[PDB]
PDB file of C-alpha atoms and ligand atoms in Angstrom:
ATOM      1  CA  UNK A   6      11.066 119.833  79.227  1.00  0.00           C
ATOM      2  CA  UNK A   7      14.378 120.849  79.519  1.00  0.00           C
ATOM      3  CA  UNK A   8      15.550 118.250  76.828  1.00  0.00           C
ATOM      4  CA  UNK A   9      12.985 118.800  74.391  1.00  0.00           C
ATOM      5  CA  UNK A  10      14.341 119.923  70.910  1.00  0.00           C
ATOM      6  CA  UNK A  11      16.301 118.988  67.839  1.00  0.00           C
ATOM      7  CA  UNK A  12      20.056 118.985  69.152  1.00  0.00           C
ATOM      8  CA  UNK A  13      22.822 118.657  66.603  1.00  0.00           C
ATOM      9  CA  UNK A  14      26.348 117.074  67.873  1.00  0.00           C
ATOM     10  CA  UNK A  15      29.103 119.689  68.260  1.00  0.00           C
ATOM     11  CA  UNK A  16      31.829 117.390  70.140  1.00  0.00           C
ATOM     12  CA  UNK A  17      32.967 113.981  71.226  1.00  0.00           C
ATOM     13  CA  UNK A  18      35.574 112.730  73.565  1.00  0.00           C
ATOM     14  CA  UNK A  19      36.184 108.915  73.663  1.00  0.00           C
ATOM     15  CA  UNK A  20      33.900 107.643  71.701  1.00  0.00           C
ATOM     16  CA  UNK A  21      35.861 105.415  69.888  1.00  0.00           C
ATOM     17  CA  UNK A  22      37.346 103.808  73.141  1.00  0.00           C
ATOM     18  CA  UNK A  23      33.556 103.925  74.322  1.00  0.00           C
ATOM     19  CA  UNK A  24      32.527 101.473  71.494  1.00  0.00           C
ATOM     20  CA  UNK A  25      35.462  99.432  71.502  1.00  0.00           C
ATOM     21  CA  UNK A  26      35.233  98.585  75.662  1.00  0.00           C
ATOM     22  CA  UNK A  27      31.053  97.590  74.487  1.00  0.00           C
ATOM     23  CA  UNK A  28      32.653  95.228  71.973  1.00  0.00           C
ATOM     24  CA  UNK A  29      31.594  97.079  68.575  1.00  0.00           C
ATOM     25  CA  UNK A  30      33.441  95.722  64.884  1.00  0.00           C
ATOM     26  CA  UNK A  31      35.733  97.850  62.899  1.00  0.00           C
ATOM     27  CA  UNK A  32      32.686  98.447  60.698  1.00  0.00           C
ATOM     28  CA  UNK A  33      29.913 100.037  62.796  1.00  0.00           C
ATOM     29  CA  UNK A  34      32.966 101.833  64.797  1.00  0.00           C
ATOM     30  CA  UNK A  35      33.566 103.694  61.672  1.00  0.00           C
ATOM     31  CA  UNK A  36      30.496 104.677  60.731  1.00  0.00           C
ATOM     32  CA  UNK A  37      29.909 106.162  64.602  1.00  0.00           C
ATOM     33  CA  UNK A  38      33.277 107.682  64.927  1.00  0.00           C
ATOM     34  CA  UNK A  39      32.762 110.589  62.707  1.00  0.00           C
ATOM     35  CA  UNK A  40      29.192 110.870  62.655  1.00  0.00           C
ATOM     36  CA  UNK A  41      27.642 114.111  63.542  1.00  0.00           C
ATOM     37  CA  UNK A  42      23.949 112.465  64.466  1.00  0.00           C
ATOM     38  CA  UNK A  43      20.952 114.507  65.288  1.00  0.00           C
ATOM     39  CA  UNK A  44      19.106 114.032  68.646  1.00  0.00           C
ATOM     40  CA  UNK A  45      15.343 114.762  68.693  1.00  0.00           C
ATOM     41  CA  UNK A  46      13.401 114.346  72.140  1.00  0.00           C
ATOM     42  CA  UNK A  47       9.740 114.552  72.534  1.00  0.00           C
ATOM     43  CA  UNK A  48       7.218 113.984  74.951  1.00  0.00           C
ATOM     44  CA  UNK A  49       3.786 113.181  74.538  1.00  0.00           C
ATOM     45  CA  UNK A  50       2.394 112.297  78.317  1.00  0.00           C
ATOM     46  CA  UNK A  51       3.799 110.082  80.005  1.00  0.00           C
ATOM     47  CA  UNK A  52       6.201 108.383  77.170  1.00  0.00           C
ATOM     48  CA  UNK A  53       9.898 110.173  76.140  1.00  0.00           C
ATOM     49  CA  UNK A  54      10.726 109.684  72.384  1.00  0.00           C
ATOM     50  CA  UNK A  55      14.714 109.796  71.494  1.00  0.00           C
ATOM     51  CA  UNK A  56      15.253 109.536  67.476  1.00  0.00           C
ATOM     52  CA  UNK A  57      19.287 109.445  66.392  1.00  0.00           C
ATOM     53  CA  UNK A  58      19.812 110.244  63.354  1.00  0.00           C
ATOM     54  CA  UNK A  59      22.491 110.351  61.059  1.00  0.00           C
ATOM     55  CA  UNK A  60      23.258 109.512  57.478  1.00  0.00           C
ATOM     56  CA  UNK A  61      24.025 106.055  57.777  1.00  0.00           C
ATOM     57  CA  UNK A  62      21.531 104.789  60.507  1.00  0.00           C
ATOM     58  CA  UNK A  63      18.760 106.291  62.659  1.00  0.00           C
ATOM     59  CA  UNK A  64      17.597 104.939  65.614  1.00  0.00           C
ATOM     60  CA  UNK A  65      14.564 105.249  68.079  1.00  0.00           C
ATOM     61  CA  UNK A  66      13.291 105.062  71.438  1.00  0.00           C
ATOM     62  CA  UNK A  67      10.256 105.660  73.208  1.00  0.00           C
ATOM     63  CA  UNK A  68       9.354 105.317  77.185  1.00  0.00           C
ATOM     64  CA  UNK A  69       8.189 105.747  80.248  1.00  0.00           C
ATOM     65  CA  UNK A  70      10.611 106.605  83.110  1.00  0.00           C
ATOM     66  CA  UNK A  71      11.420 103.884  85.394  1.00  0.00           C
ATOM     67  CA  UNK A  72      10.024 100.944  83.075  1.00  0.00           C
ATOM     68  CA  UNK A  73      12.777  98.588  81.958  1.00  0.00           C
ATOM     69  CA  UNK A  74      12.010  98.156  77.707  1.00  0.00           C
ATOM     70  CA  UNK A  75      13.294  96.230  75.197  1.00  0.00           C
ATOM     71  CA  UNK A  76      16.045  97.583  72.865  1.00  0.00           C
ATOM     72  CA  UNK A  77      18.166  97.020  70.081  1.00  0.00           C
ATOM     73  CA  UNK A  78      21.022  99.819  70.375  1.00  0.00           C
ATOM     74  CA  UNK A  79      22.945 101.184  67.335  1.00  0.00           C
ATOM     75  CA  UNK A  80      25.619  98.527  67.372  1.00  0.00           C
ATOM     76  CA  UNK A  81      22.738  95.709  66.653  1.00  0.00           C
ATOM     77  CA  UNK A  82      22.882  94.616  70.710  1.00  0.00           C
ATOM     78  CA  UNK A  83      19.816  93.579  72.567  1.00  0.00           C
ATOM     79  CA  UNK A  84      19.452  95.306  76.135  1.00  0.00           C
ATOM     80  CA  UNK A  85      17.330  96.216  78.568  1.00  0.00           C
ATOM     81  CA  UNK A  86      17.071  99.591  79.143  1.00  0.00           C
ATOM     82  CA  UNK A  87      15.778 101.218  81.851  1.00  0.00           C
ATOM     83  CA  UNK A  88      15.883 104.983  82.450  1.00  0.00           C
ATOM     84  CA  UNK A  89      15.042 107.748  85.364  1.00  0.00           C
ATOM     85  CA  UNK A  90      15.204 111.275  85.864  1.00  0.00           C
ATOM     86  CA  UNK A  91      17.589 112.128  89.123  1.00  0.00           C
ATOM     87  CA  UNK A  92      18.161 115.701  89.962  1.00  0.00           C
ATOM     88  CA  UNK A  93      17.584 116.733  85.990  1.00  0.00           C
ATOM     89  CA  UNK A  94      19.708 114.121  84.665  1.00  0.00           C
ATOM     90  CA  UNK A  95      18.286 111.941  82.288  1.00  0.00           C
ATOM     91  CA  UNK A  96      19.850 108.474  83.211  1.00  0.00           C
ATOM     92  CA  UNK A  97      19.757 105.597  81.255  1.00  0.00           C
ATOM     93  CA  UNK A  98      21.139 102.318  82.130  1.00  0.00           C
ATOM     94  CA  UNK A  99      21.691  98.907  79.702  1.00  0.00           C
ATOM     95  CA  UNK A 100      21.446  95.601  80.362  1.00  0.00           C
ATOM     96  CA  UNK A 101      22.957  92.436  78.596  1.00  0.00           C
ATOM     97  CA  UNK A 102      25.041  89.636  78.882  1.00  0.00           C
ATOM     98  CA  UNK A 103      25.700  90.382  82.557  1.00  0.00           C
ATOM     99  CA  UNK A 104      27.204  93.655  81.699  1.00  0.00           C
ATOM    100  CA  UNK A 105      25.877  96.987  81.838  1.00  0.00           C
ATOM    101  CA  UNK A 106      26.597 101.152  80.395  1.00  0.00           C
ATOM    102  CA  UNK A 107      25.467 103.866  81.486  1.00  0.00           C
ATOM    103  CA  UNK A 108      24.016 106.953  79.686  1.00  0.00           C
ATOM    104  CA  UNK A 109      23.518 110.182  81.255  1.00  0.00           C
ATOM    105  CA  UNK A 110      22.008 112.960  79.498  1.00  0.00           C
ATOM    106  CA  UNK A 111      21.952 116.489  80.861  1.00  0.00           C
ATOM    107  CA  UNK A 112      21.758 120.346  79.891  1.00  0.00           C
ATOM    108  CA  UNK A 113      24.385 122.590  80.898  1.00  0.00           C
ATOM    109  CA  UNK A 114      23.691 126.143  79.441  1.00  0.00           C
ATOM    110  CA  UNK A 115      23.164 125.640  75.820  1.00  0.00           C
ATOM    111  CA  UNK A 116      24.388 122.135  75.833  1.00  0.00           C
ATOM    112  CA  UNK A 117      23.082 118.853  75.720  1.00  0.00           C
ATOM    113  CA  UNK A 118      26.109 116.901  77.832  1.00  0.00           C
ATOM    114  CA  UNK A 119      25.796 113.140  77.088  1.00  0.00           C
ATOM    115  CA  UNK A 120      28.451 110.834  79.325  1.00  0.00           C
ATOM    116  CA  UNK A 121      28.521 107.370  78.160  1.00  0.00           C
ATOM    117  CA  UNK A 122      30.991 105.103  80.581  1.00  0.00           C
ATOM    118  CA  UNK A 123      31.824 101.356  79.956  1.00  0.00           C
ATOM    119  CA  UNK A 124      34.350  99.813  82.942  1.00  0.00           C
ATOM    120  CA  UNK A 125      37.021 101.829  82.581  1.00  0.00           C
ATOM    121  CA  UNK A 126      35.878 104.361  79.859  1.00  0.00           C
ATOM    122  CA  UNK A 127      34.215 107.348  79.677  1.00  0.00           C
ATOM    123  CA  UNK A 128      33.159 109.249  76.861  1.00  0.00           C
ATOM    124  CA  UNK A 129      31.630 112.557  76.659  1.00  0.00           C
ATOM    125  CA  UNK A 130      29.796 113.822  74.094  1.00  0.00           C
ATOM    126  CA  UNK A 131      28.243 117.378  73.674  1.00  0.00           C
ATOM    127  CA  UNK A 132      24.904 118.368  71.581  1.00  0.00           C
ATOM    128  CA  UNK A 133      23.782 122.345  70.846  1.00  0.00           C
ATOM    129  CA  UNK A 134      20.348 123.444  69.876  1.00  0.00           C
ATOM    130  CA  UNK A 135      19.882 122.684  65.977  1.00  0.00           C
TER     131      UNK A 135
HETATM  132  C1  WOU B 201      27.048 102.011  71.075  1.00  0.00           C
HETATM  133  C2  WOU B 201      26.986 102.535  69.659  1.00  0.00           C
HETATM  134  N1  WOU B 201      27.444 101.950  68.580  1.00  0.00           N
HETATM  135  O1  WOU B 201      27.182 102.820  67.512  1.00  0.00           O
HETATM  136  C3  WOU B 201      26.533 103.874  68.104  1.00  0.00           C
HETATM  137  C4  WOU B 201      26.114 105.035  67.358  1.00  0.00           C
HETATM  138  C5  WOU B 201      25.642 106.161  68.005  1.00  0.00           C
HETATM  139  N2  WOU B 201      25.462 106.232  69.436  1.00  0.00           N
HETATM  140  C6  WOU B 201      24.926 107.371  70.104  1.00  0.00           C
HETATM  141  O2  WOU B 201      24.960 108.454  69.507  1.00  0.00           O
HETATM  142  C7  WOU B 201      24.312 107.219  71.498  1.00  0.00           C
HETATM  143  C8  WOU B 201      24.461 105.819  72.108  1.00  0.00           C
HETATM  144  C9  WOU B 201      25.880 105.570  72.632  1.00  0.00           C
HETATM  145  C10 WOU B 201      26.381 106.729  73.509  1.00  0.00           C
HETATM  146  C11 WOU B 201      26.275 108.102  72.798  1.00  0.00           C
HETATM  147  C12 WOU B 201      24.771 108.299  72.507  1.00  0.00           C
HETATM  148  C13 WOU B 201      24.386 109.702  72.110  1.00  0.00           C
HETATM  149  O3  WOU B 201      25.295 110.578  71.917  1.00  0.00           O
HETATM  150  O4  WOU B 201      23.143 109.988  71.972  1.00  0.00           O
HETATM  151  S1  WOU B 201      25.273 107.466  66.923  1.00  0.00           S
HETATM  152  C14 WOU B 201      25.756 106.482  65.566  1.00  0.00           C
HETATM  153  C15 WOU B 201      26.186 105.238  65.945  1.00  0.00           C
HETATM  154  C16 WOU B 201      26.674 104.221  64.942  1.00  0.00           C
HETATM  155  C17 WOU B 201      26.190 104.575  63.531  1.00  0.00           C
HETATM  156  C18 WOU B 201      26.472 106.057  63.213  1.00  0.00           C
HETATM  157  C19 WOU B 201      25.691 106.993  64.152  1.00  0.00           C
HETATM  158  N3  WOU B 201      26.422 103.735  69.386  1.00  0.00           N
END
């Protein structure tokens, strides 16, 4: 739809205070603080594919909206994920350990607007068309 594409990131606010409030090491922090990942969404009926990519780790998911899965985010934690579209905004919730973060994805002009909030924190994080 909207989303579909290969979208290079062009900005982030936060995300260092984004990945410290989830509890991510010194280690994996650095590797996502100035990484520049690709985003690549696809559809293929009724199942979303996200692949991040970036030099030192790629990840992948695949879904159907509004069917909690299974996942194993970026910073090795095991969720469930669960995500809906509302009003064109791709929104993705994780579960684990009695916490949750949210993940909204939207376009806004030629942008790809990701907000990422954890308690307090909110990071914002902005994608353009590769
Ligand atoms: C948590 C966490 N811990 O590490 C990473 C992480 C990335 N997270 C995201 O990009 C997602 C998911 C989190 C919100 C922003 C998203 C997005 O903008 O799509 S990219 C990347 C890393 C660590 C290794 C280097 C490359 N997330």
């Amino acid at each position: 739809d909207a989303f579909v594409g290969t979208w290079k990131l062009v900005s982030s606010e936060n995300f260092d205070d984004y990945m410290k409030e989830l509890g991510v090491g010194f280690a994996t922090r650095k590797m996502g603080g100035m990484a520049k990942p690709n985003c690549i969404i696809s559809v293929n009926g009724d199942v979303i594919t996200i692949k991040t990519e970036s030099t030192l780790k790629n990840t992948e998911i695949s879904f159907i909206l509004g069917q909690e899965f299974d996942e194993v985010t970026a910073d090795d934690r095991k969720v469930k994920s669960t995500i809906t579209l509302d009003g064109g905004v791709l929104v993705q919730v994780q579960k684990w350990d009695g916490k949750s973060t949210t993940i909204k994805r939207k376009r806004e002009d030629d942008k790809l607007v990701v907000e990422c909030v954890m308690k307090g924190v909110t990071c914002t994080r902005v994608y353009e068309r590769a």
